[PDB]
Symmetry: D2
Subunit: 105 residues, 4 copies
């Protein structure tokens, strides 16, 4: 049962990382930080393992869905995917860090 429960643990820790990215983005209320939190969320989940990568993909897709329900432009979403996959691929999320974002984020 090791890998069975391991993969589920990864997925739910990953889900937790994604929600924490969102939660931080909300708290930070910081202009131009969207892409950084997109990347950091996916990066964090991915680090958990295949379960996490899986969760990140599903949740990124869901967030894109909700975002345009509220009027997100199609080109904007694409730029967001780029950030998602950049972090999910394990590349440094700080690439998208806006000047002056507090270090706890």
């Amino acid at each position: 049962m090791r890998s069975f429960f391991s993969f589920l643990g990864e997925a739910f820790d990953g889900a937790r990382d994604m929600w924490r990215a969102y939660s931080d983005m909300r708290e930070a209320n910081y202009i131009g930080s969207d892409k950084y939190f997109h990347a950091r969320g996916n990066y964090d989940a991915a680090k958990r393992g295949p379960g996490g990568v899986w969760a990140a993909e599903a949740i990124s897709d869901a967030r894109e869905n909700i975002q345009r329900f509220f009027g997100h432009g199609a080109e904007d979403s694409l730029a967001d995917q780029a950030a998602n996959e950049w972090g999910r691929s394990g590349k440094d999320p700080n690439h998208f860090r806006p000047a002056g974002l507090p270090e706890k984020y």
Copy 2:
């Protein structure tokens, strides 16, 4: 969703912890280590949080069921439960440790 995914992450980390106690038990093949591994498994799972406590219970109940199917004694079962609850409530599982059980257990 933080507490939703956290609980689930806890349940599955705990489930992994319980299975790891079984696999360690099987590998150690150490006569009279039964109660230690029961306590340890429950202790480790409970340490995860409310989800781990929940999984420790479910899996302890399941293990009892299995053992009985294979001819485990009613009395030996009651002793197992006492070890389960000992660990699950945060008491040191080493209380039941046989001296000279390899330290990797």
Copy 3:
């Protein structure tokens, strides 16, 4: 492990039901129907069992959090919570149904 996997199966059927209510809401694009869809989603999930009730609460909380991020009004939020609880408790969601909402919803 029956009740363990059952509660988990109920949580995830319920999570699916909540999401289906959102998907339908977005597809229906029907003014004044959101109260119906909140009640329906919560109703369907609660129907699953204790696991669904639990997932419904978590996701209603999640949805409120997200809508508020995008500018949702205070009174509307409290009305939304009222529709959530109404459905979750077994009361008929069709109470809020806009006459003229397509039958497939």
Copy 4:
């Protein structure tokens, strides 16, 4: 999030189906029915979808592990693997049904 929660639901309904195979085996206390329940359990789980196939594999492997712990003939374990895979692949589990097994199983 549909497919995400969908896969999870399948795995937990699959897990539940596997446990019920075991519970039915325990209740039936019926000589020569071991293969039938292995087959039926895997067949039931597989029917839930991909997530169920996944749970069935995991749980069969775990069941074999445990059975061997209490002593199980190697030709029997191989025969059990065949039954598992027969059912998981969707073939009629009644292929393995012993004469006289109550039709509620």
